[PDB]
Amino acid sequence: RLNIAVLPTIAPYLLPRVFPIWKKELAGLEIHVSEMQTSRCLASLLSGEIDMAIIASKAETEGLEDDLLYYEEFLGYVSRCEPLFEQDVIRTTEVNPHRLWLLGHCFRDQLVRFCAYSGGSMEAFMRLVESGQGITFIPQLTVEQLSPSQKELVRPFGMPRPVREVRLAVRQDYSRRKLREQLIGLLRSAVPSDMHKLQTGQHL
């Protein structure tokens, strides 16, 4: 049995894709997902309670390697009552500070960088925008798991458009290493190929 870990910002979008692959390509191994924050993921890889983690960054912590899986682009999610609804692309510096939502843990880190509700959860903000009040950002992978009436309510970023990088982070002192290779290959296989090679116009 192995135990993979995942961040709330990736889990609900990746997992629905990956689970079937775990049944076919591996064959019955007691795998289970465990949702956890980016900071606790790392600490738990070190502590030994967890064996593997799909995280949003590199580790940069002794005793942890981290191999890259794929790239996932941030996109604007702009509510109906905004002046941005008219534009077809998010100008990085034409937004309003008194209506954006964000989560400390990898989502604000990349977005607040250039930019009354803390401890949030993706869906809540995503719904506020659907309601017609505010803006929030979203991982590209998610936009296609939206109803058609939902999808019209997204807008791409303007080049150079910001992007995060999902990666699988593990501890150097790992026993079954054979697997780390297997799992890495499957996870990259879980998402389409089109967002695996950094194209022109992506600068973190």
Binding site for a second copy (CB under 8 A): 8, 11-13, 15-17, 19-20, 30-36, 116-124, 127-128, 130-131, 133, 145, 147-150
Pick the closer one to a second copy by CB: 39 or 117: 117
Retrieve residue 121's tokens. 């959860």
Retrieve residue 63's tokens. 């005793």
What is the C-alpha radius of gyration for the chain, rounded to an integer number of angstroms?
Answer: 18
CA distance 78 to 100: 9
Least gap, CB of 9 to a second copy (angstroms): 10
Pick the closer one to a second copy by CB: 31 or 184: 31
CA dihedral 27, 165, 88, 144 (to 10 degrees): 10
Least gap, CB of 186 to a second copy (angstroms): 16
Cβ-based neighbours of 31, under 8 Å, separated by 6 or more: 1, 2, 3, 4, 22
Pick the closer one to a second copy by CB: 1 or 177: 1
CA distance 183 to 102: 31
Least gap, CB of 202 to a second copy (angstroms): 26
Pick the closer one to a second copy by CB: 49 or 94: 49
Least gap, CB of 183 to a second copy (angstroms): 16
Pick the closer one to a second copy by CB: 59 or 141: 141
Least gap, CB of 91 to a second copy (angstroms): 26
The vertex-156 CA angle with 152 and 157, nearest 5°, equals: 155
